[PDB]
């Protein structure tokens, strides 16, 4: 099917919270793209809002390019850069073990992605392995972040006035990776994206988190069991047997005030110092590059 003027729709490659992602071709350019479709008739239209957020992010390393936005027959349409597998996909291809070198290569880029988003006045609020994709081709060494479906301003674009503190919020994001503040019903801020990344990094190290597979009768009960397990698992127990930097990182994120500007550069330098003490080189040879 012909979308915009120059895009050809192929097969489905994905489905997130809303719409579906299709392989496409930019017929004019001779380049594969991803095409997100959302039915115009949907109850809660979100694609137009997501495309506005992606457009505010344009210019960032590891932000997918938006090529075209519009509406065609029964669909709202966003055409984007075609990206590669998620970090969850790659984790499965690597038998659910990342080498320390791969985890540190990823940590460096993922802290930078989240910083960049924060610099554009947004928090992501869904930091998880599924929402980071490696690029394709010449972008194969770049970690991209996607899924701005839960993203929101944490400060006025003009004043940089931080949103107010609020409590009794429902859980927003993914239970497995949610900050303790999010579990307690506290408004998400910059610290919560970085705390979530801290759990993603220990998830890669361990192969699973100690609050996975908790039996419960309800979603809310499941979320509360996850909350209780996270709050009762000391960071030094979570991170036992792994370089202290992972524990230092999580202690720093948990110490941040609601409206604190994280020291991104300190957090990157933690991992970078460990990377150097291990004698690793920043050559972007990830575990999955070794797959024969």
């Amino acid at each position: 099917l012909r979308v915009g003027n120059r895009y050809r729709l192929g097969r489905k490659i994905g489905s997130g919270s809303f719409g579906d992602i299709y392989l496409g071709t930019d017929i004019a350019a001779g380049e594969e793209v991803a095409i997100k479709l959302e039915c115009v008739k949907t109850k809660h239209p979100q694609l137009h809002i997501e495309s506005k957020i992606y457009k505010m992010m344009q210019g960032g390393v590891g932000i997918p390019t938006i090529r075209w936005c519009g509406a065609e027959g029964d669909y709202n349409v966003m055409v984007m850069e075609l990206l590669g597998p998620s970090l969850e996909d790659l984790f499965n291809f690597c038998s659910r073990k990342f080498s320390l070198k791969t985890v540190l290569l990823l940590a460096d880029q993922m802290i930078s992605r989240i910083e960049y988003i924060h610099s554009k006045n947004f928090i992501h609020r869904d930091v998880k392995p599924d929402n980071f994709l490696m690029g394709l081709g010449k972008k194969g060494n770049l970690v991209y972040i996607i899924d701005f479906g839960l993203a929101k301003k944490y400060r006025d674009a003009r004043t940089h006035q931080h949103i107010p503190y609020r409590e009794n919020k429902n859980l927003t994001g993914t239970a497995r990776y949610a900050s303790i503040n999010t579990h307690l019903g506290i408004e998400q801020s910059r610290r919560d994206d970085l705390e979530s990344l801290g759990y993603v990094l220990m998830y890669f190290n361990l192969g699973s988190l100690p609050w996975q597979g908790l039996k419960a009768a309800t979603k809310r009960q499941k979320y509360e069991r996850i909350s209780e397990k996270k709050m009762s698992t000391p960071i030094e127990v979570l991170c036992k047997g792994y370089p202290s930097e992972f524990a230092t990182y999580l202690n720093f994120c948990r110490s941040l005030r609601f409206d604190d500007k994280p020291d991104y550069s300190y957090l990157r330098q933690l991992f970078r110092n460990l990377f150097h003490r291990q004698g690793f080189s920043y050559d972007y040879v990830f575990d999955w590059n070794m797959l024969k």
Partner: peptide, 15 residues
């Protein structure tokens, strides 16, 4: 009963 995917599904919206 809750499906085991309750822990990994994205919940909420931009609000």
């Amino acid at each position: 009963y809750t499906p085991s995917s309750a822990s990994t599904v994205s919940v909420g919206s931009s609000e």
